[PDB]
From a paper:
CLC-2 is a voltage-gated chloride channel that contributes to electrical excitability and ion homeostasis in many different tissues. Among the nine mammalian CLC homologs, CLC-2 is uniquely activated by hyperpolarization, rather than depolarization, of the plasma membrane. The TM region of CLC-2 displays a typical CLC family symmetric homodimeric structure, with each subunit containing an independent Cl− pathway. All eukaryotic CLCs contain a pair of ‘cystathionine β-synthase’ (CBS) domains in their intracellular C-terminal domain (CTD).
During the 3D classification data processing with a C1 reconstruction (no symmetry imposed), two distinct conformations were separated from the same CLC-2 dataset. The main structural differences occur at the intracellular domain, with one class exhibiting a symmetric arrangement and the other, asymmetric. These two conformations are named as CLC2-CTDsym and CLC2-CTDasym, respectively. In the asymmetric arrangement (CLC2-CTDasym), one of the CTDs rotates toward the TM region approximately 35° relative to the conformation in the symmetric structure. Structural comparison focused on individual CTDs within the two classes reveals low RMSD values (~1 Å), which indicates that the CTD undergoes a rigid body movement to accomplish the conformational change. In CLC2-CTDasym, only the subunit whose CTD adopts the ‘symmetric’ orientation (seen in CLC2-CTDsym) contains the hairpin density; in the subunit with the rotated CTD, no hairpin density is observed. Along with the absence of hairpin density, the subunit with the rotated CTD exhibits a difference in the linker connecting TM helices J and K, which is poorly resolved and insufficient for model building. A key aspect of our revised framework is that ball-and-chain gating is coupled to CTD conformational change: close examination of the state with the CTD rotated reveals that the hairpin cannot access its pore-blocking site in this state. Thus, CTD rotation facilitates hairpin release and channel opening. In contrast to CLC-0, where movements in the CTD have been linked to the highly cooperative conformational change involved in common gating, our structures illustrate that in CLC-2 the CTDs can move independently of one another.
Residue numbers in the entry:
A (entry chain A): 14 to 28, 88 to 225, 231 to 297, 301 to 408, 419 to 644, 774 to 841
B (entry chain B): 88 to 225, 231 to 297, 301 to 352, 362 to 408, 419 to 568, 577 to 644, 774 to 839
Amino acid sequence: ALQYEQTLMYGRYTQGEDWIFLVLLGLLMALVSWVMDYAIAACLQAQQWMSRGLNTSILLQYLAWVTYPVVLITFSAGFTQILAPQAVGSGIPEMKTILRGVVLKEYLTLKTFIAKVIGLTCALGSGMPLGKEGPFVHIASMCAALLSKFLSLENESRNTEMLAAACAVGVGCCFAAPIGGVLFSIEVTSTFFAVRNYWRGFFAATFSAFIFRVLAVWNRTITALFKTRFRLDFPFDLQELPAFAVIGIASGFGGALFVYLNRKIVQVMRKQKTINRFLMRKRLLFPALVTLLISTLTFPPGFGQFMAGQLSQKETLVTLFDNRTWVRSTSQAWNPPRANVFLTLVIFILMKFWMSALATTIPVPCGAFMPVFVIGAAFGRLVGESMAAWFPDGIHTDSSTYRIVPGGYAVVGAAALAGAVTHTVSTAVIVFELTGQIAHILPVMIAVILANAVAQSLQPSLYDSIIRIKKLPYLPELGWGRHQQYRVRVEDIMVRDVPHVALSCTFRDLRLALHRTKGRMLALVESPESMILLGSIERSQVVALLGAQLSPARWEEQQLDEPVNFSDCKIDPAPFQLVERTSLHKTHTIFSLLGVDHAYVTSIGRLIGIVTLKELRKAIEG
Amino acid sequence: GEDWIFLVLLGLLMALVSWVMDYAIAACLQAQQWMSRGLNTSILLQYLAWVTYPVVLITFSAGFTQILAPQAVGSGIPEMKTILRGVVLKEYLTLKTFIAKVIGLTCALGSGMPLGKEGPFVHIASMCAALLSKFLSLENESRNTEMLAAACAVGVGCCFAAPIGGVLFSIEVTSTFFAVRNYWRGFFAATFSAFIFRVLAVWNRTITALFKTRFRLDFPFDLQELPAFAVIGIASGFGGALFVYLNRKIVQVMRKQKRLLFPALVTLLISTLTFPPGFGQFMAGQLSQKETLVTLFDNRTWVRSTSQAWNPPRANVFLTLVIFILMKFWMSALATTIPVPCGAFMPVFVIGAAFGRLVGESMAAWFPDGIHTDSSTYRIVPGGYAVVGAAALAGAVTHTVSTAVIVFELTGQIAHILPVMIAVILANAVAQSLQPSLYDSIIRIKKLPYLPELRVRVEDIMVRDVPHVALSCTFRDLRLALHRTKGRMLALVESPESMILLGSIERSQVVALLGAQLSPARWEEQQLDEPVNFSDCKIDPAPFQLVERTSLHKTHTIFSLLGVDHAYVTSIGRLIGIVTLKELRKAI
């Protein structure tokens, strides 16, 4: 059991019925998502009304423009800190750790639910570049846990499956994409998923989508969030494929750079102890300063006109996916009177990159999927506009028909950058669900594959990076194509010094052994000379043996050093063990599936070594 | 960079093979129509050609498959699912099997019989991967299984021209775990195959989607039309369960009751009923499978060209659709059991499309001016109903939910996603409640090893025979040990008294050295009988074992993960038992 400790940016962790349950989970998640969306829309509408009311002087417009988001972010951070400090940030890495066996202290309580809901609503009510997929996963998991609490009024296996279904429900409700949501949730929270549990997520997401449609028709887009209208007859040509490949490669490099920049930002001010202490005594100055800095640069009368600061995230995504060519309201916002579309796109890309990283490193419930999606869409739109300008009449034409469509480039770029950042290939399906069309399928697959290859060659995923930052249990993923590990054996990476005890030992031996292990379990051995393994023992239990046979109720303590009879103790008969010539592939696979953190190496029945997650991490990294 | 090169070469080879096979099938189908229509004006000659062409093709396919490689008969998905679980089939991935499968599939699909390609394509892709792996060596067991899984994904994708849907379908029918890296490798190889197919479709010339639809993008369906899309799913689930039951019952009956007569009789019976000017006008027998699927997916309303085959002068669309559904159902159920390389995905797809079209036309006739009246500009689109029904029936038969993605890549549109998902979920629920999957039924028919599904520990289910050899054993015990047992591999122990496990030795190696030592040398065969020298063998030093007190659930989970079929039970380093899928006799 791990407990949250508060830090500046992220924190640290220190030491029959199925159908009804799925239907109820889907309905609850749909209702909660609808309520949150309504609240966020109301907040944005209030911001627009207040901004339109005060059109007198630039000073007052600036004051309102920088006062609304700062107040919203400060209130969100304060409310989250008062109720549940552990509800800060994305919830995908924490649930990935939970699904592997580890237990977090109070991660699935009602207070955390209230804090997460209110904080996400308040933080997303401002205009900061933040997402909601991780918070949605966490909220869905808490909803499933509370439903299990209610419906109760073997067990361990059931809970994990329900949480796995809840993650898919959360992703699907976040993107309004059942299939894409389930496939994305499978890739980011597990490595070996049972085929039997494949239908549960699809069923729950389908029920959620049906409830969404019913609510949409009872409340008055309906089909797709960001519906696009592209021609079905030759949307692209053959010679445009190199452009899509270039987009994919650049997106992979950019995703690696984004993950590296986020990690570097987090690390830098974990140093600088004086600034860190001064901010830790404030607890509300850092988010306020970040919000004030970001909002100032997006002021439309000032610097915000050169990066489309007047547009919101939904409006920014809608204009990039349109079926018009800007080069030859989308063009009005993306073509300021003093510049062209290219300069605006470049400035938008750079500023949004660094601002999105910095904003995702602040203490509020937030995600990082939509910002990178928008950045990738902008980069793809830039590439498409360049191609359209270079070929005004087409790339293969007789009567100048079938011109270049720059919106497919934006779709391809968004999917490629999202996949590169998250190390997933389901962003293709996600973007097909989001846009409502499947015409630009092959370029999307090509770009996603290339971006994933480059990103996995360069840097780890964002969620794995956050896991490393928070010091949670971390099993690095084996190289997809970077290297080979079919020749490395367990005899090399193991540690040849094993904390162990003997069957015929004395209490002095236990006293000497206990302090130097620094581990959870002790290995029972027949005899020191034979070194034959018989089982595993608990460190607390062998402490209790000394505490029980060496006690006031009987100095005398130094008189009693007889050999310890292990009959009273309880021994694990079959701990997890391996053999001498086991390959790294099998060890990694069993560690990944069983969710274990410790294995014994055995040679002809004798104890020769031990393997831990740390040794595996060094073996993979080196 | 061996992985990327292997995947690229696999994709290229599979794309080329699929293109060649499609060209051959199209040539055969055109040659049928040429002789059918060009030079015949009499009823008797037309009938004679109509029956004699498919009969000759099917008889040649069956004879060629039997003579060359009998293992090429049937689908390839159940056998590859068995192979990926650690079982070994005798000669399932050789060159003769490849040639027999290719020629038999080309000849069988050249006729007008209702057969598919997904299983044969999976088998051919796996064979291509095995041959490529053999050629590239100019041998880790763990590396080969991953490549076979990638080959299955490539085969499905090339069959349906649906890369993502093909990968998802292949993972769901030939595996028990969703491995993410397998998904990534299949994605990569299917993307390369799709690129090659796109290049070929431009160099030669149904580009993009195979059965592209042109439904309107603004309000294709209403909320009140959803109950129909659920009725379709429930009916499709029931129909899929009935289809699996009927196929199994057809297979069983022939067992209770000269090998070139049954396929010929089946072909002559089926082709007689589909003869157009006789009974073929009442079930649209003049259309091929591609044209049958094309007309059922159009954006026109019949009840308000090539779609006039469903409206004969002496009948209407409803009667023709019902007759087509019934006759094609029983004909496909019968025809999928003849000794030729064949699949069953497409006939089920067409039957589901016909049922969906029937339901959609009924709804369109019920609401001539559109649902919710008001004389609105949005009316019923019966093509989407056909898509929904086809996807639902295919998913119900195959116990899969990736048929939705498959149909989305097939039609080129994703406008009907919610009804398709609802129908697929309902059909899967009903079918899984009623009957097992078609591939599982075939596995149980062929009596292949399989793992069931999931107090008791590995000490109880184990068997203590465990054929083995000792390090100090002579050639007399090696002959004695080999004769009694029949297993693929043998265990190596230190001594009969010690019984300390040292690894495992293959059956091929021991019989080779026994023959080599007792080979003619410079009576003397029995004279030497010296203790064997194991220093020149191929000893596996790390077989995967199980501790004595391991639980059944832990044993079950490791067996599914590792793709193995037998484990060694060990006490303190001593061999005490073996577990070779004895969970089938204990987890049932």
